[PDB]
Point group: C3
């Protein structure tokens, strides 16, 4: 019922965090996202929203997260609204990204993004999937490292 | 049923975190809290518990969170006990508060509070609301900034 | 039903975090864990998996967490699979451990572990309990303090 849908939608955010933090950009994205996927990270990158093939998104994530020794996404505070086979989710996110020493040198090594997801999900034949991801940053620390 | 109540009570903590972190002290508190509201932040401020009108609480939050460039509340680990139209919730909280550079100068800029909420909720005609908030700190970093 | 089981299993992780962070190693472990308990912290300590009496585990936790002024475990992203009276849970964890000043001196004072739990639970006559805990670290900061 509705509570099973809610619980499955919340769990998708655990799997979403696992994509990045386990660096598993091949199988897991198919279990988490629709194809194509709408993405909006403009609040952090200045790149406007786009709708992209899932394999492109995965390849892009693999390339960018390859810059980090590790990451940790702590996603909390899910506010889920369901209407049959669609849902919206607002959540908190705290995302830590550590640069290797070879890049960070004697300086800061951790890029922090805090803020919110305002995402959409759809109920597919293979279960709920996140069809749109939008990240709004409230604060960043060491954002220059995302460039460095 | 009971599981819908639990899920709605947990979601209230997402909305609670949103009050502070989106700095929305006017509408959201009515959706999250009863009027009046009992508050106990004594473990952090030394001010004893009080029961206050909700508009006072909102105005006070607006004034105090106005000192921060941003905040992030990560609330996790909800332990919810429900008895008809009342509930208790114990949870973990990690609350980050960043001071603007104009105030922090060359020193630390982030006030960290970790610890627990031990809160009460009531089922109102318009849904669950948090009727009592109690924060017990296990640790703080840079607490002097909450004064500065 | 299944959703009550899921919610109870997720709540166990709140109580698990409370063992360490409230430093309550006597009563709470009986409410959270089976006796005996399988533990695997090898990814952090190099000690291989073992199955130990619960009172030994509690005594060991009391001794080790006695080194810290405070800790905070933020457990998020639960992915729960249930099969009757057994479950597996994968989750994110961010665990902070602060050393007292008397030990940290003028140096770093916070040991950070980020990574994952990959745990098992069993439905006992007194409710769900965590029967196996496995922590896999993705990153640590100041791990030398866990020794110091």
């Amino acid at each position: 019922d509705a509570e099973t849908d809610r619980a499955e939608i919340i769990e998708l955010f655990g799997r979403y965090a696992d994509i990045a933090d386990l660096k598993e950009f091949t199988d897991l994205p198919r279990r988490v996202h629709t194809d194509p996927l709408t993405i909006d990270f403009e609040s952090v990158t200045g790149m406007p929203p786009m709708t992209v093939p899932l394999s492109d998104y995965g390849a892009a994530l693999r390339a960018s997260f390859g810059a980090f020794s590790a990451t940790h996404h702590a996603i909390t505070g899910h506010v889920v609204t369901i209407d049959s086979d669609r849902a919206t989710i607002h959540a908190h996110v705290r995302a830590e990204h550590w640069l290797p020493a070879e890049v960070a040198g004697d300086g800061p090594d951790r890029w922090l993004v805090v803020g919110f997801y305002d995402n959409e999900a759809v109920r597919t034949a293979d279960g709920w999937r996140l069809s749109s991801v939008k990240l709004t940053a409230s604060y960043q620390e060491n954002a220059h490292l995302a460039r460095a």
